[model samples]
Target: STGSATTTPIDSLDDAYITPVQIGTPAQTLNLDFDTGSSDLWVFSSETTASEVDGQTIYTPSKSTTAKLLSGATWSISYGDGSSSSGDVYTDTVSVGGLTVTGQAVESAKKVSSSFTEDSTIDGLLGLAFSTLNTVSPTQQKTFFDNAKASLDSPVFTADLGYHAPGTYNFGFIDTTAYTGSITYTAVSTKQGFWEWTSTGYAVGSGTFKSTSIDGIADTGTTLLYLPATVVSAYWAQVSGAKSSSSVGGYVFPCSATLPSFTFGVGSARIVIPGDYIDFGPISTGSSSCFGGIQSSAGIGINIFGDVALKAAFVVFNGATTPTLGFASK
Candidate 1:
């Protein structure tokens, strides 16, 4: 129902949220991480330290079917959190999940930190989050999404989050079957790498809170939903003698009592974040204090509804068409 028909088999390796993409054929394969956070695709080389090589897949030029180095375009990147890595550029045939892509650009980081310097269950990240966050020239170089637009049954690709699993996340297509019901969608504003929007307001237990509004952003790079201090305290006020613990610094409602049903406002549509998702994981601070899922994100840019929000609903990112996001009940 979008633009032209463009379908291609994508080699998505791991069944989990992330995977190490192999570029080139078996005899000359190159392993690279597929991250949706940032747009650049990178790989590891023999020059990397032993520490960074721990949990990652190694890319050997000799093992690949075909590979070639990019003479001048070397790159090094550092995250806002101060994490950094650098590697030389190379192009080759890439493969994952039985799908292969040709002339894919990848970075081979030579030096890395312990967090990433060693094999850390990930070789690299495939940044499919948003076209707005693309690092390279969007016009000249096409991102994975840019190229996959045609082949996808749906025009968009999405990452499914598992807040209940802490770091457990997955990526896939929206279940079209779920769209039979009336779904609500919001128009997104794309200035950066992600389509950002505002939270119109909220409702808890049939009670209204900020019906007028609260600002929020949808980010896959981030793992949790952050709220304003005022919002957290206000909701806690209704949690029937709820109290805050110094250990977690988050308010907790009476666990024995039935939790309230909460819904978020995104313009005309009401996106509900069930209480079960709120009390997702348990806290270790006290005698098993039942922590409220929503917490204070005062200084943290905007409230985020990472993968947790997506798992409960079917999301469609109409990238090639309207550049908007759609949500339907799962």
Candidate 2:
């Protein structure tokens, strides 16, 4: 018989609040990097030093009194740009969505890097994606979800990135709760750590863009949204007295005017991304000119619809379960 699976309630908040999750028995609460950018879950440890873990959240097993670390096991992870972390192995009562999995493998970051420390908003990332990219190795190479797959209600997870809603951004089992009909699918590519797909185009409120931008597509692992230079210009063009400047990058533009509506489409299903999503981290670099969202990857061949846009829909990374991606309305 298949093992039983569990689910948890996830909460999203302003950049000021840190999210704490249980990592071991007797309950050691560790803040994590809830990043969709990569499929890995790790936390800093007691060995990492107070200065390194300072201003950042770390999981000290001694505090839990119920965790166990695997000796002689080595673990290492390198990001796309070659930044990485190496560590010892450990596991304990890992719980999320209110369900606890005993002996869930974990990594203790023995060495530190600035990239993981840059974001205080997220303490550690709970990666909810395919199994191939798990960072833990030697003792355990697959992720918590990969290890927990047989136990989950369905061997799947869904991300509901609700940007407009205060208590949005969540994860859970991909059973009936996340869909209405038979699951739609999208083929997965063996290459690329980023979850990429071909799009039909975008729809805003009552209409669709109908034409694909050579740039601007969705990627599950990217943290920020990157639009086409033209799309950015066109979006800013919709606003009044909006002039282009190099502030906060892109064609910086802003006004008291209500932002327009928008939605992204893959096929028959369309994901609605809130206009407020555009204003997240809005910046005024110079001349008091404000730019909505960060702009960097333009002309970089790295177009992405990162967290801001993805959080707007209940997205199913159906790559593993089927040939096509699935989209559902929250």
Candidate 3:
């Protein structure tokens, strides 16, 4: 059987794409950020400190008949930005779209960082990365995909992220009409617990596609496209009033600055990020200086292909024994 769900962006910048998930006997629907960058299906919960709870919906395991506490289990996860959360674990029946999985590990937060607590747009995050990255301890827990892998006819899922529009996530199968042209497949290394791959080269606007290799991960959890400093600088150089600033962090330019498209290769495939997305948005509310969607990944250690890039292509996160990734234009 196949499963499909709509993932909608919460902001004009397409900051985070969240999907509704069902947990418990009488479903408690919570909007969750379906993050491919991490692997821990943690959520805001009744257990979360009252001070840490904002306007987000919470999952109360006690109200679910199938929910069972994984006694002595705890999980803690911190993001690259230093935001963090930690909590107890419970095995419960969870459903996404219409696909149901029993005994799914549903981490209920006891404490959350300000970043999470203040983000009322989402109840929590559902990590779609490899289970190896899961933070649960005392007893490791499987992700929804892993738990349902055996039950699926084809162990694969696809992401169709849209620009300023609702996207889609499909499990167990790919919708033929969701994309155009044949998908270009690439090898993925899960050793790092990420959908890591190498891009053959990249081009700034109409410039030549430089024959250089860049390794990075497809991270839906991240906000922007972060490549090497050289690549980022080259792209920004084409913009009239763009410069890297220490004050706001990363590259910023005049709101009206002209932008060029960014193109990168995967084997023989070429995915182009339109100039519109390159404009990103203002650094802060009602600012004249705007931040570019592409940034240098030097500080991040590894390059990241986030929503800015993913929304330009149909991405398949294949879960075969030896995982692979697919990219196709839509």
Candidate 4:
């Protein structure tokens, strides 16, 4: 079966995106942050403590006759941003787009970090990375894609992101109408449990496309684009009044600066990120200093091609026997 879901960007930042998914028997629709950075289908549920509720929809398994507890199973996950959530596990009917599966593991969050509770719109997270990274303890479980892959017409999914507009995610097959021209495919290493791929090169503005390869993960859960210090420095140097804040605000520049469009090569195809995308927004409520969407990966340990980068093109995650990544111009 095939699955397709549309995404909604949260706030004006375009920093994160959420997708709708149906949980439980009666089809309780929950807006979820689908992550290619990690694997765990967890959500705010009846099992959660009230203080952590914070105006988001909660998943109630008991109301669903199809729900069944895993008896002695549990799951916990902490993100690179220092946010965390944990809870017991249950098996129930789960659906995304039109793809439905029975007995899919739906984690019920009993506790969540303050970061999650404060964000009212996000209902939960749907993990799309890999089952190897699933946090379920004692008895690990397959991710939604992992379980649905064998049944899909083809083991593949696509993510088409937009700056502020709604985007789409498709499972099982690629949507030809969404992209122009053809798609370029590249190797993906799931050994790291993330959609790990190497970017062919980069180009600042209409400048030359540098032949420097960048190793990074396509992380939908991450907000900013992180690259090696050398690459980040090169981009910031072209902008006036841009300052570096290694362990904190990343690169900051005057709100008035004219940012340049950045480009990256995926196979033979090049995806250009609009200049406005690199200008994250004001560093504070009404500050003249703005944060850059692209930052140095120095302190972060690994470079990441997050939403800031993903929004530039149409991407495909092909879970073939030898997994691969695909890119196309929208």
Which candidate has the top score in lDDT?
Answer: 3
> What digit string (tens of lDDT, one per residue) describes model 1 on residues 83-105?
67776666677655444557776
> Better model by lDDT, 1 or 3?
3
Candidate 2 Cα outliers beyond 4 Å, as residue runs: 1-20, 64-66, 72-86, 115-119, 136-140, 164-184, 203-208, 213-221, 241-247, 281-288, 294-296, 319-324
Tens digit of lDDT per residue, candidate 3, span 28-104? 99999988889999999999999999899999988988889999999999987799999999988889989899899
> lDDT, candidate 3, residue 78?
96
lDDT of 4: 0.91
Q: Give the TM-score of candidate 3.
A: 0.99
For candidate 3, the per-residue lDDT at 144 reads 90
TM-score of each: 0.74, 0.76, 0.99, 0.98
Clashing pairs in 3: none
| Model 2: lowest-lDDT 10 consecutive positions | 1-10
**How much is 54 displaced in model 1, in angstroms?**
2.6
Ranking by TM-score: 3, 4, 2, 1
Task: Tell me how far the alpha carbon of residue 190 in candidate 4 is from the true structure, in angstroms, after superposition.
Answer: 1.5
Best model number under TM-score: 3
Residue 78 in model 4: shift from native, Å? 0.7
User: Model 4, which residues run further than 4 Å from truth?
Assistant: 246-248
